[PDB]
Amino acid sequence: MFDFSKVVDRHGTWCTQWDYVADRFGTADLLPFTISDMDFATAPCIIEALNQRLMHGVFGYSRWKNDEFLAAIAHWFSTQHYTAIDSQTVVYGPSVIYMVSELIRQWSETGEGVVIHTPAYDAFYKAIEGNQRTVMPVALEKQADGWFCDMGKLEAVLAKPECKIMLLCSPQNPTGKVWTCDELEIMADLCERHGVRVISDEIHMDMVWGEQPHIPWSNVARGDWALLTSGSKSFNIPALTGAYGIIENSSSRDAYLSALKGRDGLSSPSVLALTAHIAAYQQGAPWLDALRIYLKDNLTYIADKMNAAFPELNWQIPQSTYLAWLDLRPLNIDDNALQKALIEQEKVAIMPGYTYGEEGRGFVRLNAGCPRSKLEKGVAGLINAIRAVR
Amino acid sequence: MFDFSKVVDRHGTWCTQWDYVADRFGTADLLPFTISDMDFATAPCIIEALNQRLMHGVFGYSRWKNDEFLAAIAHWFSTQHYTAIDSQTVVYGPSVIYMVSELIRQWSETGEGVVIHTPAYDAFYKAIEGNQRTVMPVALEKQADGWFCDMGKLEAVLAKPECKIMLLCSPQNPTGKVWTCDELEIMADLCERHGVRVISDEIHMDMVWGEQPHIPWSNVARGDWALLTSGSKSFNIPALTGAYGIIENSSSRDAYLSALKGRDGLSSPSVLALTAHIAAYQQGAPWLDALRIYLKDNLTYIADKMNAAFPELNWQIPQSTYLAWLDLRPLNIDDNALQKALIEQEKVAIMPGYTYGEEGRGFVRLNAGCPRSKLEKGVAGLINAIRAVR
Amino acid sequence: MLIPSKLSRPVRLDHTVVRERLLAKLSGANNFRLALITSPAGYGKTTLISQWAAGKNDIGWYSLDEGDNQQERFASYLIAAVQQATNGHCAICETMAQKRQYASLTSLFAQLFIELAEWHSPLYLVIDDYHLITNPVIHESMRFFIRHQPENLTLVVLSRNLPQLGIANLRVRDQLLEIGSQQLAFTHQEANEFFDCRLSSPIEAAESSRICDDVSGWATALQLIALSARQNTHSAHKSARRLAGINASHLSDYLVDEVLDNVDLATRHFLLKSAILRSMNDALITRVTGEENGQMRLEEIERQGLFLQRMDDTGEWFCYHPLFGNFLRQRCQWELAAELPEIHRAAAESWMAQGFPSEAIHHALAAGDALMLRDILLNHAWSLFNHSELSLLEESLKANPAAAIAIAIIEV
Amino acid sequence: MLIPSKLSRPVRLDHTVVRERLLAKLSGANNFRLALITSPAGYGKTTLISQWAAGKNDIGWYSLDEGDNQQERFASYLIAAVQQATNGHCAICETMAQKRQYASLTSLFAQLFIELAEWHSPLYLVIDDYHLITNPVIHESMRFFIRHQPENLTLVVLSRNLPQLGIANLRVRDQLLEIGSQQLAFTHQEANEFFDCRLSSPIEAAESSRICDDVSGWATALQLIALSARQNTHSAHKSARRLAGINASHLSDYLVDEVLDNVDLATRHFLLKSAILRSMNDALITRVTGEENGQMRLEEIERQGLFLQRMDDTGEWFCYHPLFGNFLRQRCQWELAAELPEIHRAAAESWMAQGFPSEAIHHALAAGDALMLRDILLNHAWSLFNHSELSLLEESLKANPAAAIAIAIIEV
Ligand SMILES: Nc1ncnc2c1ncn2[C@@H]1O[C@H](COP(=O)(O)OP(=O)(O)O)[C@@H](O)[C@H]1O
Ligand SMILES: Nc1ncnc2c1ncn2[C@@H]1O[C@H](COP(=O)(O)OP(=O)(O)O)[C@@H](O)[C@H]1O
């Protein structure tokens, strides 16, 4: 079938992981685990579809308000998340974060707030403060089994007269928490009661490992809302910029479309991104299932090795991602010492945790979306660098 | 060598010209001349380069602050416009209009003005008013030989305490006027004297037919300025969204880069757009020269046929474009009657002139960037529809 | 007023096979929150629901049409179905629905559940053809409904495809019972029984089974072969060959060739004219088609097997099967494109005569007769105001805008 | 103060060949606004410009270095060249440059042109190595200069590549004279003459011609083969084979193998130490290298043919050819990486001794000696304030950062 147990070079292709030391490191001869793409080649169906769109030759203006694009999106939702969508509400955007920022500019003024769950994805802070909107964070709490938002503190935050938007990352990043039906119910009710619109970033929707399925925002969605996503992380094609979303209250959908086409002139899509998304959603299910199996095997290998090297970790593989958010606090080790040991004694770049702010102290973020050959070296390096500084 | 005397189907490829009647027409069985791309297939060098980037397979994150991208841009400028550039001032953007809008948001407040020359490109009004900045127009005046901006009225406009930006389209659109050295000198001096920054949109820089060549903004540029362009119109690849520009006063370049990467999350480029631009600029000169010859032949064929059918037109081919901005006012004909005759009696869609506002009354805009087979039908249709309503 | 044809369980199962395979599956429907039956049109799922419902009395029924896509009318009809299921028990919410003194469907449903909690017996509510709803507000409110309904209530939704009801939530908590397309198809034994009960010549069982699979057990396909053989058009296998794997477009020209051309032209005109009506009874028939033995005509049509179905046992209201109905509409918009506006006007005035201004408005705007709406308004301003058909009013005039200006001068 | 080595025309006339065609091309340089000479380093274009300048007296000269990339120093040196070309005629702009009472380079140049218009004789100004300028303000001001200069002035710019001077504007109006890379290369006859005048063994023209083309007529290539044959390293064709089509990297290791290893180690140390100096005279040599017969050492080096060139006929100042100079710098940063800071300090204090605080600052920040800058400051606060070297002061502090923090405390 498919083979993921092979290394593609990725040298000399301008890629931010293998071709650029700064600022991931300084030695430039490291094994990189810092950036959150996957080392795999995308699905052969997407490649063949692009190859066939290339033989056409002409690359004139194209339209995204298609009929095959929307049909493919609806088919993906129905057969992979058992959710039905009104395909006349799907909108296009260059990137997920662009749509997030546009909606923030639309559903709030300057100086008002945007709730997020921390440790949050990096770019969320950039998008929120770049528009001069204040971040209002709510910390997930790790305990016995996974991470748990405390609805008391969340409701206390939402009650503020300034909080207008809730930027929900589902599945969460980097913890990998998949929200349960009950959590989504309560969050939606609280948001509706306190007049807070919701933006649901769901770009990780496909990489779920738990036995409970991820639940879409639209099923619990009320009034104005938005569900933004892309097949980039799922199929490893972020180099073909393109994202889609679902905005409701057609007045808001229309305001967004006006801003996208008129004010910022971004309406012309990338015809190859649409070709990739169509081919992926209509024929990329076997490839994606094989990849899911492989990524779960990698995560469980990490868990075995680590929990066997230091019996007092008790690390469980995350609910849904291919990014291990390792908690090293039960080892009483200092992170700067660990980072120096990793860089110099071992030559392995592993993104530290304090870059996520204060909630990240004591963690590391290990990209597991790579062939096992590389993962073995990475985890051996981490184990050695821990022992050598313990 | 190359062959442009052949018709590519372009049916079923989502293209806004051949697949979408609305709102170019209503009959949906027309010969379309409304949208400003070219019916040609792009250069075989670009196609081969994309094809070779596809066989790699991986489409992870990429970087535009490259060394081959910048080298190709500098080589293009030096060998095609005899202008040298500091390649560490080149910035990237998703589209030309996006960069225009970002700079407008940066170099002015709300309610201030943006000078443009009318008849202006359509999207300029959208970008200027979408940001709630008032347009302050200056009308070119057609006379004996081409169009002439009157520097008296231009200076009168610039003197306003509200005018802050000048959005210079060079070569102009749709008139096709190429500014002379003296015009550029005087405009730059006037702008500098009255504290107006300049944004030079130069996306047509390559399609110049006159004997006097195109002079970039940078040679006359001072203080803060910007020169935005792309190889999209030149090589007919707008379906691979990507544009570049040169911003000066590194504080402004840095503010723009911050807005592009941080606030709007658009920094990840389209690796295939960069591949296309590199291949085009390093190897696409023979193709472009052949295409230049063909387009000038098409424009002169239009001129021959029209000026022979109605000896009182006296239409000269434009200075630089592949869009004929035909002046039909010396025929005393009504445009709505002409448009109805063109749609119904002839089945030929030709963009009317009044869509450019009041300065466009009496003109039509005929896309000449097509094989001659189609151009013959288009011009025969226009001649017939004129005679049948004369 | 409420069109009775929309609030009654279809009947007239003169020759319907009954299969436990599906009735057994539905037997436990009280333990769940939602029974979702989905398949393309013509499955016979609606016939099964009517069968399953013939053995209950505390069960409301609600058939949908595109006009239901407005929210106030939707609420009115839904509360009507609830009353029929509980025998007038929910009076307060009924008056709130008739007087439109509710802020939003969710508040109306909260009030309904206050009353619903008191009822202690199993309750059932059937909503037919949910795919015709495209209003997002209605979807939202129906999700709220399913989330907050009392446990003794069970909702039954018949739809063409997966609806936007928050189904994944229910599937997670095992509160959902589904009967998909595959289960609804006729098996070999059922096809044998069907061709036995309906045909003049008996068919060997294997031959019926061969007809059964090559058409995928699709019910309306079987009905087509049956009625074709009734007139002895073909031997069965030839008609099945004509029908095997037929798509929407080929179904149309098949209907054109075999069902329209094998009747007399008078009945053809009758069908094409009557098609534009949503629900038909004797009065509307005799008004639009001019033929006076209207009830005679309808009952004889139903005897002929042309996809006409009652909507109550009293034989009062009738409806076409949506496939055949839409086909007849599209064919009439050509064969009689000239005679459309006067036919729409006759239908509209006949509707108003029976006391239903809303269908009159629909058919009038179909006709394009402004002064028709003028007379509808000065003839029922009393009921339009006292029953507050205000959104009806805004859409109607807004949908002759220079003539509509009237609403402009009314706006201030 | 102004380093004289930067304001004087190089004057070496030993084995140089006279190229008449290029001089003819330059003969009409007064009719144009700009004479642009561009080629990779080692072309000999600078030698041609000096040859073209040996026959004029009213001609200023200005050699550039990376330190010129600051604007005030640039203006000072440029006005100095103008004075040398007009013999002190422009006094007002000179005092304005020395007192830095100008808003911007454009206003200074406007004042200069007021004075420039009065002069009635042809004027010439040579700016060497313009590729070292990367300041956009300087580019802008030089474009203004070229646009507004009086017609009797002609600007000559020597550069590696096309500069940002608004050249297309001039090319349109035919106010530009270019001498590109191709014209500057030595032809066959010129190569014959060159090898004749410089070698101890006569070279057949065809063999010289083969050596001429296979190295593309590149001047410094020829000089390399010549000096190699002077020590009788090789027969000429073998060295040419070693040099044919050589890139930057292979030029480096060629220099390492053939020019550095074929001298005595004392001279090697002399070269490697002296390389870090921009312009060298006897005093700086005897200070840094410790060898006391400094002028003797320099003149004997220049005799040996190691790319040392005078900067005036008085034999006072010397400079390395930028290729060989940068090579020696990169090699010294390894062979003597340990001895760098004390050498930088000696150079800095010797510069200050001669009255030039700016080069002292440069070499000190190269050494990384904070208290060295402290002493430079308390030793020349009088000249730093009276000659207003304030931007020098601001930059230097960031590169004694705690002292810069004290400067930040001074900031307020
Ligand atoms: N049990 C049955 N026995 C015989 N015929 C049936 C049976 N069920 C359905 N049919 C035939 O198939 C058609 C089914 O229509 P149906 O699918 O119930 O409409 P809907 O679109 O509302 O679901 C009917 O016309 C009926 O004649
Ligand atoms: N006319 C000539 N005769 C002999 N040798 C020359 C002549 N011109 C240049 N050269 C040699 O070539 C080199 C040219 O250096 P040059 O290109 O003038 O430096 P720059 O980088 O400033 O242009 C010098 O070292 C010189 O020895």
Residue numbers in the entry:
A (entry chain B), B (entry chain A): 1 to 390
C (entry chain C), D (entry chain D): 1 to 399, 405 to 417
From the paper:
After 3D reconstruction and 3D classification, a subset of 176,969 particles were used for final refinement, yielding a map with a global resolution of 2.94 Å. The overall structure of the MalT-MalY complex is shaped like the capital letter “H”. In the complex, MalY forms a homodimer with each of its subunits bound by one cofactor PLP. Notably, intramolecular interactions between the NBD and WHD of MalT are directly mediated by the N-terminal segment of NBD, indicating a critical role of this segment in maintaining MalT autoinhibition. The MalT α8 helix and its N-terminal segment dominate the interactions via packing against one side of the PLP-binding domain of MalY. MalT R173 at the C-terminal side of α8 forms a bidentate salt bond with MalY D182 and E185 and makes van der Waals packing against MalY C181. By analyzing different interaction interfaces contributing to MalT inhibition, we found that MalY binds to one oligomerization surface of MalT, thereby inhibiting MalT activation by blocking oligomerization.
MalT is a bacterial STAND that controls the Escherichia coli maltose system. It bears all the hallmarks of STAND family proteins with a tripartite domain architecture, comprising an N-terminal nucleotide-binding and oligomerization (NOD) module, a superhelical peptide repeats (SUPR)-type sensor domain, and an effector domain that confers DNA-binding activity. The other two MalT repressors are MalY a pyridoxal 5’-phosphate (PLP)-dependent dimeric enzyme and Aes, an enzyme with acetyl esterase activity.
